[PDB]
Ligand binder design. Structure first.
Ligand SMILES: Cc1cc(C#N)cc(C)c1Oc1nc(Nc2ccc(C#N)cc2)nc(CO)c1Br
Ligand SMILES: [Mg+2]
Lengths: 427, 552
């Protein structure tokens, strides 16, 4: 009996064969990181070297821990997940509490460290194999495969779920109002206490975990505050609706009303009860464009009218847990981006906006990689599941730089879209 | 001949079981031939007579091609392979010279004798069972079973390069100056010792290997300083391509036309301006392998403009991790962009081209971006870093455009390099309507079946028109409509369209498209002083299509 456990039999869906995803190539800097990081795991027994009989292979990267001193090995078990955890989303599902989104504040801790105690079923290992590349194909890759529930594979949480609850239970006791959600590598704790208390309640938790084996690095700083922002503190009771604003104008012109007719015109299939005709009638004319013009019969009526059915959300907008979530993002420029997370067209379960800062410090491919990790987490909280991003970037560019600013332990599903039309105006 | 290397345990796919095929035609002169190689084989422990009990067979063939002093044994493991688990594929790619470090002496060893020296997973042997038919009297043929990696077996190249790497590891350590690289039947060794000291190390490596049962040769028919590596002419401080051959002919065909281009590209790694848009365009005929194709004017010129280039032999230099990596890009025209990566402004490190084969409408700036990108990938793969860029575009241009564009891009560090042509914005649509300008309400339908359309406008001034077109589409008219307004408007105009199509296409500010119409439009856009476009829904917005549609 290995000090920590005894393997939990793992079996991928029948007719399913292990992952075989190619390894993106990397920077020498990054190879060396991984090369060191792995020689460690290697030593600690965490992982071993594999032979040619292991045709399997999942990708790996190296990222900046928390803008820290050294690297982090980030495995993209996206494929092996679909192939397993989906039936461990069943055989061992981790239930998602619909109230956490309600808490006044959710802190997010990284428990990814506990897993490395639990040895992975002796037979499934072969699947968690990855390969650190080499520059200019001069050397055959380096091949390592796991021996402990690895971080990132949506199966460790499910296995460790057992032992978690147990570790937690005697805190979920003294603290029955706080909700604790486990999602892969992280714990999300919610509370309605004034922050000061919360923060403490969190550390009150952090030490509980700690004096019980688990180690949380989440110690962002100490007494000296180099204007460095404290732990992950979301506030979901402020996770409300975004603004779709028509403008109340001093003066209206053919053009203004022209565009205005458009916006409204397509909102049309978001809310099928918006009427323009009374407005679209003043443009039936072929008048100049800079020209100013006023109302119609029920124009003003229709403006403040549709101004209404607009401020009142839709219907048939219920979440389908059986379906998949979808996040569309659009650049707004000058640091602003917007997003919608639907399941079927125009039935938006939610929308928002992300904004970074001003020039000198940020580029597009940072805002997107963050707007992404933002929308992911709202999603994890709200529905207990990350979405599939319809990213407005050139596949290869993203493929090249996403790691460059990626901080999350998990990776969503994404695809690219070269066409966001009239949508930018609208939102 | 055989080593004490641990063996890679092997398995047959999930449910399957070893092959039971056979072949029994006995030509005395060959049954001898085989039993010959076989006795000298078993003797060398590479195979073993097996007692009839559960074996699975496989085809035995004898061979002697040209210059046959000896015969050659050959089993067909096709049916066995189809039953063995998959392995870890190696050699997918070849190191590319442009990123090799300058080494002095070199030596390629021959390791073909190889796979016959590495052991075969003790248990997986029963399957390798083949049978050389002995007496035609249908007598229990002399039956053997392999002990080393079989020549055709699936898991052989794999289980081999494996065993290899493991054998080099130690030697690779006590000799960090001796860089090795293996590729199949070979084992190349490069160092910075003088041809003597170097032929020492080689001997040690040589011995080292031999202790591991891997026997290597001392001489055979090969060559020296140039090296013939896969398609590369390798020299001690320069590399370059093996002389290419652009064949001239009477009637050209796809098979040829392709084989030309492919040869052409390969040259590009180092021949500065190699162009290829035209010769390739001639393959829209995605079909016929023998369908002879006319080298229609445009191509020929190009091909020749390439002959003049290959015409003068040029080579390349290596990577100096100490120095900086740079990349310059120059636009050529038909959507083609050339570049070359170097550390020193004189001879090259590697060069390349980037052509936009993505459809119909594009933009110089964007393209520039796409280029940069392409390269950054390559640079990461080859050098593992990201060259500092040198590009023919000024920040007030680039920055302005990434500011407008709806998608998000990201160029790495770059330094401007003024040299014709020059990536810029030939125009900019105005953001707000024009106070005083004539408002042209364009439009123009088309008959989907009769292929008959119309295109016209109606201005605020009450200036109208409709121009008859035949052989066109709703899209073609819709643009022609925007081309009209433009034509008949003054140096300033406010244009209004219904097609999200026509609109979009104009907004991206396509530097070009061969679609002469778009061009015609594009040019008018450049000649204008100020333009303003506006999009309004089709079947229910303004009130101007109708009065012209009712006409159509
Ligand atoms: C790619 C290659 C080809 C041949 C073969 N054949 C032999 C060797 C050992 C090779 O490896 C490397 N070669 C070089 N430079 C080199 C330069 C000139 C010549 C010549 N002539 C050969 C090799 N540098 C590195 C360093 O990274 C490696 Br690794
Ligand atoms: Mg129309």
């Amino acid at each position: 009996p290995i000090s920590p456990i005894e393997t939990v039999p793992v079996k991928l869906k029948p007719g399913m064969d292990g992952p075989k995803v190619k390894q993106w190539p990397l920077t020498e800097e990054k190879i060396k990181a991984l090369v060191e990081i792995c020689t460690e795991m290697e030593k600690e027994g965490k992982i071993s070297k594999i032979g040619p009989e292991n045709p399997y292979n999942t990708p790996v990267f190296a990222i900046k821990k928390k803008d820290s001193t050294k690297w982090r090995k980030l495995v993209d078990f996206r494929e092996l997940n679909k192939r397993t955890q989906d039936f461990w989303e069943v055989q061992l599902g981790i239930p998602h509490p619909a109230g956490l989104k309600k808490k006044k504040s959710v802190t997010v801790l990284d428990v990814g460290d506990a897993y490395f105690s639990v040895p992975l079923d002796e037979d499934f290992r072969k699947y968690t194999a990855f390969t650190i590349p080499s520059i200019n194909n001069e050397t055959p890759g380096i091949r390592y495969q796991y021996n402990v529930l690895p971080q990132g594979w949506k199966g460790s949480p499910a296995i460790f779920q057992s032992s978690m609850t147990k570790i937690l239970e005697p805190f979920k006791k003294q603290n029955p109002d706080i909700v604790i959600y486990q999602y892969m590598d992280d714990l999300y704790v919610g509370s309605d206490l004034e922050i000061g208390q919360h923060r403490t309640k969190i550390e009150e938790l952090r030490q509980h975990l700690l004096r019980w084996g688990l180690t949380t690095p989440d110690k962002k700083h100490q007494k000296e505050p180099p204007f460095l922002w404290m732990g992950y503190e979301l506030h979901p009771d402020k996770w409300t609706v975004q603004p779709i604003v028509l403008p109340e104008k001093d003066s209206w012109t053919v053009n203004d009303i022209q565009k205005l007719v458009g916006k409204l015109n397509w909102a049309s299939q978001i809310y099928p009860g918006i009427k323009v005709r009374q407005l679209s009638k003043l443009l039936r004319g072929t008048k100049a464009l800079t020209e100013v013009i006023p109302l119609t019969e029920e124009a003003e009526l229709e403006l403040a009218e549709n101004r209404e059915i607009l401020k009142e959300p839709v219907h048939g907008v219920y979440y389908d847990p059986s379906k998949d979530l979808i996040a569309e993002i659009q650049k707004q420029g000058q640091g602003q981006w917007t997003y919608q997370i639907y399941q079927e067209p125009f039935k938006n379960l939610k929308t928002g906006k992300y904004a970074r800062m001003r020039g000198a410090h940020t580029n597009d491919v940072k805002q997107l990689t963050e707007a992404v990790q933002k929308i992911t987490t709202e999603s994890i909280v709200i529905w207990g599941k990350t979405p599939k991003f319809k990213l407005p970037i050139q596949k290869e560019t993203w493929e090249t730089w996403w790691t460059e600013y990626w901080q999350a332990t998990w990776i969503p599903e994404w695809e690219f879209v070269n066409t966001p039309p009239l949508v930018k105006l609208w939102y | 001949p055989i080593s004490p290397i641990e063996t890679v345990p092997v398995k047959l796919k999930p449910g399957m079981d070893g092959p039971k095929v056979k072949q029994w035609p006995l030509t005395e002169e060959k049954i001898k031939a085989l039993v010959e190689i076989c006795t000298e084989m078993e003797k060398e422990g590479k195979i073993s007579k097996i007692g009839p009990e559960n074996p699975y067979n496989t085809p035995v063939f004898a061979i002697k091609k040209k210059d046959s002093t000896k015969w050659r044994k050959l089993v067909d493991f096709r049916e066995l392979n189809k039953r063995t688990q998959d392995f870890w594929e190696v050699q997918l790619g070849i190191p590319h010279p442009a990123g090799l470090k300058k080494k002095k002496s070199v030596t390629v060893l021959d390791v073909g004798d190889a796979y016959f020296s590495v052991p075969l997973d003790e248990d997986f042997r029963k399957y390798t069972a083949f049978t050389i038919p002995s007496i035609n009297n249908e007598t229990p043929g002399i039956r053997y079973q392999y002990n080393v990696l079989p020549q055709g077996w699936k898991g052989s190249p794999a289980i081999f390069q494996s065993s290899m790497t493991k054998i080099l590891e130690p030697f690779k350590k006590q000799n960090p100056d001796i860089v090795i690289y293996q590729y199949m039947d070979d084992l190349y060794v490069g160092s910075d010792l003088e041809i003597g000291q170097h032929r020492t190390k080689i001997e040690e490596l040589r011995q080292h290997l031999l202790r591991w049962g891997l026997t290597t040769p001392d001489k055979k028919h090969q060559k020296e300083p140039p090296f013939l590596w896969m398609g590369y002419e390798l020299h001690p401080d320069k590399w370059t391509v093996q002389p290419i051959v652009l064949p001239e002919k009477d009637s050209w065909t796809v098979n040829d036309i392709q084989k030309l281009v492919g040869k052409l590209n390969w040259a590009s790694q180092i021949y500065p301006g190699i162009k290829v848009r035209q010769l390739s365009k001639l393959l829209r005929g995605t079909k016929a392998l023998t369908e002879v194709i006319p080298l229609t004017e445009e191509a020929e010129l190009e091909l020749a403009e390439n002959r003049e280039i290959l015409k003068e032999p040029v080579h390349g230099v290596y990577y100096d991790p100490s120095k900086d990596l740079i990349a310059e890009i120059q636009k050529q025209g038909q959507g083609q962009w050339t570049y070359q990566i170097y550390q020193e402004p004189f001879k090259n490190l590697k060069t390349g081209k980037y052509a936009r084969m993505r459809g119909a409408h594009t933009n110089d700036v964007k393209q520039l971006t796409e280029a940069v990108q392409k390269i950054t990938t390559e640079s990461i793969v080859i050098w593992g870093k990201t060259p500092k860029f040198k590009l023919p575009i000024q920040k007030e241009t680039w920055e302005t455009w990434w500011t407008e564009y709806w998608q998000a891009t990201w160029i790495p560090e770059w330094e401007f390099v003024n040299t014709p042509p020059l990536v810029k914005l030939w125009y900019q649509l105005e953001k707000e309507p024009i106070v005083g300008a004539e408002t042209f309400y364009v439009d123009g339908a088309a008959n989907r079946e009769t292929k008959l359309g119309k295109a016209g406008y109606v201005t605020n001034k009450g200036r109208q028109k409709v121009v008859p077109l035949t052989n066109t589409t709703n899209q073609k008219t819709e643009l022609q409509a925007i081309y009209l307004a433009l034509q008949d408007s003054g140096l300033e105009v406010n244009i209004v369209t219904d097609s999200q199509y026509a609109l979009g296409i104009i907004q991206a500010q396509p530097d070009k498209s061969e679609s002469e119409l778009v061009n015609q439009i594009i040019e008018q856009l450049i000649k204008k002083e100020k333009v303003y476009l506006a999009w309004v829904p089709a079947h229910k917005g303004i009130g101007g299509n109708e009065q012209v549609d009712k006409l159509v």
